[PDB]
Amino acid sequence: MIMILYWSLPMILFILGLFCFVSNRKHLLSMLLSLEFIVLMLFFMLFIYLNMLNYESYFSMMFLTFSVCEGALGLSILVSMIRTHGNDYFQSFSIM
Amino acid sequence: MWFEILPGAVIITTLLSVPIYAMYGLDKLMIGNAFRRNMDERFSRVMYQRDFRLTDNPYKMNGLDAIPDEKTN
Amino acid sequence: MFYMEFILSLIGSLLLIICVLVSVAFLTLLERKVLGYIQIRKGPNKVGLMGIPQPFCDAIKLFTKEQTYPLLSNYLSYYISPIFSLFLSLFVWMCMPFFVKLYSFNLGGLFFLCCTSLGVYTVMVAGWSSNSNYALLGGLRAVAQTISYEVSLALILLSFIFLIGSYNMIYFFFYQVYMWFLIILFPMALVWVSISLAETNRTPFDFAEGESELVSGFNVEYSSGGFALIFMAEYASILFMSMLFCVIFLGCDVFNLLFYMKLTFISFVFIWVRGTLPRFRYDKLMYLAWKCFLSFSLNYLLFFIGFKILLFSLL
Amino acid sequence: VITNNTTLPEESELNVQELNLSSAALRAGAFHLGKQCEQANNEFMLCRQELDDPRACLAEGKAVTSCALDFFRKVKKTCHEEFTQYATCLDKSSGTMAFSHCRKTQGVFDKCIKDN
Amino acid sequence: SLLKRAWNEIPDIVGGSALALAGIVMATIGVANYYAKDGDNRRYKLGYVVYRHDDPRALKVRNDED
Amino acid sequence: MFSIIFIALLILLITTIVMFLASILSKKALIDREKSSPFECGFDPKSSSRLPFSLRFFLITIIFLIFDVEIALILPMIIIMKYSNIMIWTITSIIFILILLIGLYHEWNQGMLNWSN
Amino acid sequence: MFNNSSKILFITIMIIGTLITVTSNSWLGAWMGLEINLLSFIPLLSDNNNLMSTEASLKYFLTQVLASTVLLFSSILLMLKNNMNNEINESFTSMIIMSALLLKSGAAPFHFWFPNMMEGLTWMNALMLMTWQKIAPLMLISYLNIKYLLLISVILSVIIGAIGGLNQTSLRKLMAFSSINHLGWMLSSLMISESIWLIYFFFYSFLSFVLTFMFNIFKLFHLNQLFSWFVNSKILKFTLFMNFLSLGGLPPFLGFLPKWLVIQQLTLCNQYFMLTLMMMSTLITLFFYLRICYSAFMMNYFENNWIMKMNMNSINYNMYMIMTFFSIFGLFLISLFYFMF
Amino acid sequence: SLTPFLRLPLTDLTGCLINHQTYDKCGKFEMKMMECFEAYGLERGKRECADLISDFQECVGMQKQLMRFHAMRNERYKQWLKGERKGQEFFADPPRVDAY
Amino acid sequence: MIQLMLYSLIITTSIIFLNMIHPLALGLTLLIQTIFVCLLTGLMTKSFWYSYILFLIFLGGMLVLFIYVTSLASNEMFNLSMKLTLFSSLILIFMLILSFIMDKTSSSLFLMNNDMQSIINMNSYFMENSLSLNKLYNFPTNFITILLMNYLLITLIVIVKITKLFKGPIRMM
């Protein structure tokens, strides 16, 4: 099928990104590491679709701007994490 | 005594100028043309395909002699 | 024909590689002679004939000397970091404009920005891999350098780019045919050299090495093999960045001989400055980039956005 | 997408004498060539834009190539030496085949064509 | 005053903003000048542009000298 | 590209050979428990280098991520100046650089650009 | 909008973010608005005086980031196969979009994060989360037309939303489970129309807008505090708590009218079986509301006696009393409303 | 394309985000189809736009043609692996580079 | 051809990335992949302009998280997994074998490279990125860029407020 010969690989890569975002690693940063991994794969598919259009790749910039802000915001929340808990370990948070 | 510096500067000046003056030499010896075609624009690339097809060598030029001189009409 | 074309491209890169690798050896001698003359010293004068074979006389030692296997270092990372430091130094040369084509490189100006940023990881990984207090301080002193110069670097490149119309470096030649952009861009030339120093981590911005603050910076735990490549990779950066100043502000007549008389002179300037200024303070640089340079660079984008607009109406 | 009922002209019709003249040789005569075949060119290029069917502009295309081939026969008849020097220079002077370098030899040709 | 304090503390932002202010001004001249010449209609066109003699655009062909 | 990748590999091989020569050409002597000890001015080290290294430019560190992503939007300017509407291009570009300056001066005045103290 | 000029901004940018989503004529445009909304809420939500608040700022961020990420994943996939923002016949690719949106709003199967982040929010924060943040997600689900997936969420929402709430004593955590149930009614109202949903949402926000103030004005966070809470006139305290009954949708009060119009339309559309499970499960929701009214309906209590006085903010209380009055007498104004016909 | 319920002025902001109307092989194909959606409305349009949607999808998504192409290649390989072809004459004469 | 080998490597590096635990091991894996994805994207496009931008953008994020990794997760451990090295190396060669015996006219992506375009396409003879990036700064889509600007500036106000610089540095107490 068309979807299997052309769009399978990025999707299989995407789900592997999510399975990193949920696996049990001690440090919160392990979530941030896997966060921009997924974003890297989202860019890849979005770039497939935008190129089916002849001239629409400019929207890649729009996507990248929101990619950094969620990473940048994701990093700020970690900073605020440290200065109330002292450490970023997942097991240090109240389970609720 | 400021002369003693110059031997250092002469060598660096010469060595860094070897490449560009070498390829200008090699291209003439090996292409027949000093400069290689510039694939900077679609039109340049397009025509480069055209030359590579006709003569089977993009750097061998096909002057008027390739034109069929006469037509019997 | 086409099959032959790429063969020549290989030769050019190899020719450019060996020539750059040779020059950085002779640059190090030139650094010692010139820095030995600004100081009232004589400089290396005995070895061989009049000191010319000095840098080769040192390349022997740094390779007949044993590797160091630090006890607390992640050895594979510690062992590989020199490779990529040298590789990234040589690799960035493939974008240097030639009218005798070597690589097309539309968007060559960007390719500069990507490659120069990579040079920080090699310092960064080497310092952390060494697993020594000073080495780590050197690495994190180098990263903070990037946080400062990186943003202002792009903006200042953009100003030059507006003048030429494209990111292809070749166009610098055509626009600098009557005069030199140095005249139009005098403060940027002066600013650009300042950022160029940060790129190569030189006095007055010598923080990665950090000599006399850190014992030897991120190099403190390297020896014969690794340290040599770190050194050569350092001076390859100076040589290129000096050239990149010559293509932007000084004509960019790559096929003329004088261009290489100019290139060495800017290399002399880099040594000249090292023998004049004391090192900045680790924070004063980061404040300098954000408080002054970034604001300065943005101000002229308006000046050149207006000037290009005004010039566009006339032409 | 092409099916049996779609009508393509037969092979014999598409055959026609072609230039087969390299890039540098073409760029040499560009400015003098253009002033002559403009009537055919504009007629051909106009239809191709409004009407985007290659088979529809088949007739006009043959006019364009004939005019080009017609021009060079004249050049072959008179300025053969000069044109080759201009083309050779234009080819071997820069990687872009820019006109800005070969102004001198260009002058030699322009005087040949305006005297003949 | 204010002018003095900045001119003494951060002279670059004053000089830099002085040229920045120059950009807006001579950007306002050039932009107005652009539509004072009808520069949307440019005598040299990218691509091979051919009009019919009856097309409305065919009237607006900018007629220049060189 | 494909030309550049090949030379990228070829260079990497060449530079790799250089230490592979150095590793053999290097004089070889028995490694001592002290020879491979870290360097910390000749006195044994109190603290591993892998302890948490405090940070003071964290705030600038985040601002650096942002300011770059606006470099992605200024760079295309030149490329599309010949092809765009001059009012839209002129207006938008200016209110792009004023926004950046205003943001910078705002934080500079608020003292965020200064390091943690 | 309580402390500094900065809080004023984040509130507005939240409004802009939500509006961009619900006014966007394409998935990609809609997704952008969600990102705008994301960072408008976090700074409002994070306060370092509380060890709990920063934890709340986390769970929301990880959940929402994943939701928008998966949401964008499917939207790209959706128009990779159809080449349109719309799918002619709904299939799996459209289901995936629905799953993300439900998680974005904390519907039943993916609600877990939602109560578990309510421990460390101020009351004014919970209102922004409970009411406004559910606009953009639920409003996009109106575009997608999968029945069974949407239907399953309703059935689980009312069930999990009710049974879970019986065991809580923290009012903030209790209201979360209460809000999950009302969310179930929306999605049920969303497979039939939107005008009902728009009406029903407005009333739901109205009641929650009221109950939040009463806790917010008197800073109550636990059931025990209700009994210890001091009021001059036990008649007054008795009447304030009569808003819970409206939140339970009892017909003598205004809070039933919303439930009522959702049944007159679901029944009109023959969804009889759904209403049985929903309306029946609402009783359990009505239960723990009465557990709160234990502190009001009985009206002589053993209370601590180091307070004789009520200290309350005027403007909040001034607006709260007005809102409460309609919450008890708002039924006779159904004549005026002309949005149901 | 989706229809916002709100349709406040904000929709003007993001309406023209992604389109096919800028120098595309399917610019005319989509305008007809989407026009028909405007004439009949969204829900009813999905039942009257059978041709326009299929044509537009076969112009952008191109599945209909790519999925012809593999049938040709696979059927070329199937013949050879069955011995019905030969190694010497596996492929047809290639097209001229200066074409397409 | 290298496109398939790029497919193999991006898959291979993703398998291991699922198994990294040490944050720097994750970072090195991610950095390597950011190179390949950047390379791969430019294959199926009229220019590599976006690969340059993407590469530049992510490298900014690469440095910053090392600064925080070196402050938060400094003391952690690696473990060479002989299961992993064999598994990746086993499949990697296996995948590389297929790419040599693949009908790699079929595997090529249908997206039109610049050369894949016709010769008649008049719009393909302009600057490499003129048209594509054009309407990023023309009516009406320009307002989207403007909207980002506030969004980015408003973000710049969010970090300082979340961060609360004045209450100290960051240490992994």
Ligand SMILES: COC1=C(OC)C(=O)C(C/C=C(\C)CC/C=C(\C)CC/C=C(\C)CC/C=C(\C)CC/C=C(\C)CC/C=C(/C)CC/C=C(\C)CC/C=C(\C)CCC=C(C)C)=C(C)C1=O
């Ligand atoms: C007392 O107060 C003071 C201080 O306080 C302590 C100071 O710190 C200082 C500090 C001074 C400085 C920082 C000065 C700058 C110097 C340094 C940072 C480091 C010192 C080293 C140098 C200057 C030497 C420079 C060169 C290197 C380090 C090596 C670089 C690598 C090189 C040259 C190799 C290049 C590669 C090539 C292929 C070139 C061509 C061929 C060869 C080399 C091959 C050689 C031989 C063979 C292959 C054998 C073949 C044989 C056969 C076939 C038979 C001063 C001055 C001071 O006064």
